[PDB]
């Protein structure tokens, strides 16, 4: 089924073309170019990687600067009325401003760019696997994701800018490889080297890693994020261009931190999670700390699996509300923001007052819950992470904080709004961490702010099951490399306890959206099934001849939806594989022949250049062919990929899947091993759909 | 040619078996085991990864503790005679002790374990590529590498323990997967899961990464070292076991630093390069520092390429001296240690005395050259790296230090001794760094110890061309994550200038040794040559039948050196591929048949278990078959790999090499695309030798 979910939009799903056509007409290998053209490609490779890091760091500062200025002046308006002891007018100002900011973010998503809803990371993970996710990296998708995240984080919703920044950096990288938006591209001739799926995969890998770095000021952990979780294929040359892009981001981030520390960015200059200045120094290896630190890792895998189980149920319910229309998506976002505003305002009435933010109880008494609930989310993280504050938060007020963001983490992820998953899990993980550090009390020497850092890392390993990128991200946030063995100890337990119950949250969202992700290892029942038994449960192969009539090319373009056709002669010779995108091009160019001649090498080079062969902005329904041209002939030999990858009929599905994913294929031919004369030289085409364990188990149900 | 160099030993070279036989008789997939046996394999996977990190960290402390105790008391004996103003007796004590320590290290190498010479990193890089390097991970190779490194670093030679520790950790991992030495293995039944080349590749990857971590106390940079440089194949599950092993190493290293800081390890307790306690704090971005920092990167690529050019010439000369016999290897090591001792002692006589180590000039005057030359190498690094010492070393004495270790770096690498390449390059790189920082003088605010750190990183990127692992190694040495953009700036220039002249030093050593390393990308002339043209320049394929006579099996075992044979019938059916190691097993078991029957499924399971099918300690010359058994029959069907990877005759050599390296193959069948009856179903076998650009360019010379 070529139908899946992209963002919040049901769409048509194809695959990407990573395979190289080795004909010199196409010029797919950059090593076959001139010596001057290689230096142009190398210089533009490293200029694009610098501009990706420069623009991701510049946009992340502007999102950081606008959110705390909108939410900073919004709390002054609510603070203006609570000083006059008017709590009922301060509630409506707080709820009304949060409803208007959520309305701006959610109307831009549903009515202008529905793929800008969510974090966008499970669709970049699908795109770098080879799945052509449409409307993902446009210019209007990026602008809605930027403005819809400023309106959502400043509205006090339980979400972060951490997730959307990974998609913004991937959108910047895709727009720089084309020369701008899709109908406003500059036609600079040097940009023709990047009009292929092999180079767009390299660009979006640097762009998604710059967004992880812009979210956490972590230039090493951003490269380890894309290497471990997001990207499928990797080499050491891509590893060094990616690491260059993330170091430009921390140059831009640290240069604008020095400016916004000198008070010239306003009175709300000093930003959020990247402005984290608490290093936990001289952690003391006391032997009685084995019991609480192991319980941090055990509770992170238990709560991380329970959060994955309940979010999988909430997102199934939200898919029913989303299919009721576009006005039902807007009411779901405003209903969450209404419930969030009355719970972030009404719940500090139930807290206790500790003796000397003053809220609802007179002077000499400050509210420990209004410190966390009535602030921004990135400032509430730094209060729980704070060191040398041994009993700043009571045990009762931390249970209310933990129980609220357990509820707000479930209902905010999935609304038609640019959402995130890092900051809801950090807020939920730091709450039970400092609860377990306060409950130990005097029987431990680990700081209670360090228990909150270890708790936020454990809930993220229990939910997302990434571990080596999470270690370096939490080491570059705290700026303490001596915290590695105690951080890696709780990521070990939380991933182990978490993997024993269910899958990661990114495998669940990829399964809910129906995106055909190809996993690295085959199932053990795939080794007992062969490729030739898989071709008997599917219709026969639609092939073309080497010199083909125009009416046969038009017939396979109207009556089928396949994108590759084997090229035969009709003993008979298998020439290779021609794509659908090249069959439309010869019908649009009208490179037609009178007789059944096979042309020469100079005939195709007058009609086609390597630039127009790489373009994909063609459509078959605009091509009008009369019956005078339906009897002519097209020579398909200069446009056929004459070296496709093949398997034999007795090859297993397990080893064909390993070949399909290691090389990065879209189509895999099946040739006969029977070796007889008068045989068809191709008996199957395998695609991504045929080699998925979800689809094989429905046409062969007796294998599980 | 199956002849190459392994360490300092000419040896026979085969490849490793990574491909899975999907017959259930072999049990190669661990997912097809019982649920109890999977938990035994998972527990023993993570126990072995903990024991690799525990034993690599324990051995690295003992090498650190023994070297500075031997060299510490040796300098007290030389210091005893220079206080009596007897410099001629202090010279003979210094030269005599250094000659005796070099003699112990070099006799153990030439006469007991000749593969323990050098760093061992270019042979682990070859082993993880699929090349079966013999005598590399034995128990007596590890013990010679441990003792031969204590005797060599304490003898004042220009080499480090950094390189040999990568080979020691790989030897620990290989011995733990077998249960001890090769003739002293414990027969614990749970260790049968690790008797394959897929699991030895995972073990040695963690062991080589623990050795990089034990050398630099860098648990992140050790994982990035194996990922970028050493290992060929990588997945995210191996990435998390490797990162667990390196964090056990820094637990053991930091626990024995706290003990050897309290004076209980002796008066020479505080060790070397892992005892580096100079963080360079508040680096100030002054705009006049663009000119000296760019010159640090430009000189690192120029001197790094010139060092690669001259070491390639010195190692060619040393191969002529090594082939003159075993006593010529011992004299080359003693001649280098004689030249090193008289230059580390005689050269501080030429230096100037700066006013108040006192050497050769009276009180009120200390020698700035005796501080660097007459100490250990790891203590001379910390003096140049030292901060807030603005003019401790004169310009004249630093030219003598730089010019000496340019000479000593060339002649010490290659002697029959466990050598290294990190510490000669760090000493050479920190010398010109502090020369360029002293020459700027007052016109810069970057510390001159930070110029030495940036110079040592630039010469290592100009020579070894690794960049992302070198960044994190130098960030975890200095313990300063804010030094990333200025460190990555000079690694960018030095790798760029270095790559414009020649190759890295590990590609040169791999080429000098003749090891058949398979590179990731094919050459552009490989796309114009097909696989079927490659099979016409080689002898025809030696095949066997499915039920084969014993005399035919003995004939291909005596008259050929091939390790796989296609299994046919003789229209005719291609069954698959049988290995040479399984043909020796049925001749040793004498599973012989009277008639030409094909056996059943229960007949082979009485003769062979999955444990004895995985063992490789068999030899054909001990197998004695009389002429009464030469007319019998062997059923080769239950031992044949029935799903091998195949290509067609019209596939190019470029795309066959990509399939060969992505999957990890040893043999690749070539099937006909001609599709005729009465044809042989196999027309070629491709191996690692056939797909090498060095070998294709000699049988097809008109392609370059
Ligand atoms: C301060 C800014 C510093 C940035 C500049 C830093 C530029 C820099 O660091 O790269 C150096 C450049 C290599 O560029 P780059 O690493 O991107 O190119 C890779 C390199 O060519 C590998 O050798 C290839 O692998 P292989 O051999 O086929 O196996 C790999 O092919 P593939 O794996 O992708 O298929 C290539 O991608 O080499 C030069 O000397 C060009 C001098 C012109 C440089 C002009 C740069 C403007
Ligand atoms: C403090 C010490 C902490 C160390 C313990 C930390 C142990 C730990 O962290 O791993 C958890 C373990 C996974 O073990 P591990 O990651 O090594 O195994 C990989 C995992 O199974 C992947 O799912 C596989 O990929 P895929 O699915 O096929 O695609 C991969 O196969 P392959 O790619 O290799 O072919 C496997 O290698 O999962 C459990 O719940 C077992 C509970 C028993 C654990 C008992 C451990 C003693
Ligand atoms: N040329 C062809 N002739 C016959 N069947 C085909 C052909 N190409 C693909 N198929 C089969 O049709 C089914 C649907 O595939 P689809 O038409 O989506 O191919 P595709 O669009 O080329 O593949 P993808 O969607 O991965 O790009 C698949 O199971 C595939 O095996
Ligand atoms: N069964 C076979 N029949 C004929 N030729 C073969 C066979 N196997 C390998 N060859 C060819 O013989 C040449 C030498 O190969 P060699 O005998 O070293 O194979 P091998 O030992 O199996 O391979 P490797 O050394 O990579 O393990 C190679 O070019 C290869 O293509
Ligand atoms: Cl998403
Ligand atoms: Cl987020
Ligand atoms: Cl996410
Ligand atoms: Cl070596
Ligand atoms: Cl070394
Ligand atoms: Cl080395
Ligand atoms: Mg399709
Ligand atoms: Mg061989």
Numbering used by the authors:
A (entry chain B), B (entry chain A): 42 to 397, 415 to 628, 634 to 767
Question: What sentences appear in the manuscript?
Answer:
Chloride channels (CLCs) transport anion across membrane to regulate ion homeostasis and acidification of intracellular organelles, and are divided into anion channels and anion/proton antiporters. Arabidopsis thaliana CLCa (AtCLCa) transporter localizes to the tonoplast which imports NO3− and to a less extent Cl− from cytoplasm. The transport mechanism of CLCs has been well established by structural studies which revealed a homodimeric architecture with each protomer bearing a separate ion transport pathway and three consecutive substrate-binding sites referred to as the external site (Sext), central site (Scen) and internal site (Sint). One molecule of ATP and one molecule of PI(4,5)P2 are found binding with each protomer in both structures.
The cryo-EM structure of AtCLCa in complex with Cl− was determined to 3.0 Å (AtCLCa-Cl−), while that in complex with NO3− was determined to 3.2 Å (AtCLCa-NO3−). Moreover, a β-hairpin structure comprised of residues 44–53 is observed in front of the N-terminal loop in each AtCLCa-Cl− protomer, hence, the N-terminal domain (NTD) of AtCLCa is constituted by the β-hairpin, the αA helix and the connecting loop. In the AtCLCa-Cl− structure, αI–J loop covers the ion transport pathway like a lid from the luminal side, whereas in the AtCLCa-NO3− structure, αI–J loop moves away from the ion transport pathway and leaves the ion transport pathway open to the lumen. In the AtCLCa-Cl− structure, three conserved Cl−-binding sites are well-preserved. The Cl− in Sext is coordinated by the main-chain nitrogen of Gly201 on helix αF, as well as Leu479, Phe480, and Leu481 on helix αO. The Cl− in Scen is coordinated by the side chain of Tyr564 on helix αS and main-chain nitrogen of Leu479 on helix αO. The Cl− in Sint is coordinated by the main-chain nitrogen of Gly161 and the side chain of Glu164 on helix αD. The β-hairpin of NTD, firstly identified in our structure, is located below the TMD and occupies the cytoplasmic entrance of the anion transport pathway in each AtCLCa-Cl− protomer. Two small side-chain residues Gly48 and Ala49 constitute the turn of the β-hairpin, and form hydrogen-bonding interactions with the side chains of Glu164 from αD, Lys571 from helix αS and Lys370 from helix αK. The structural information suggests that ATP may function as a molecular glue to stick the NTD and CBS domains together, thus stabilizing the conformation of the β-hairpin to block the anion transport pathway of AtCLCa.
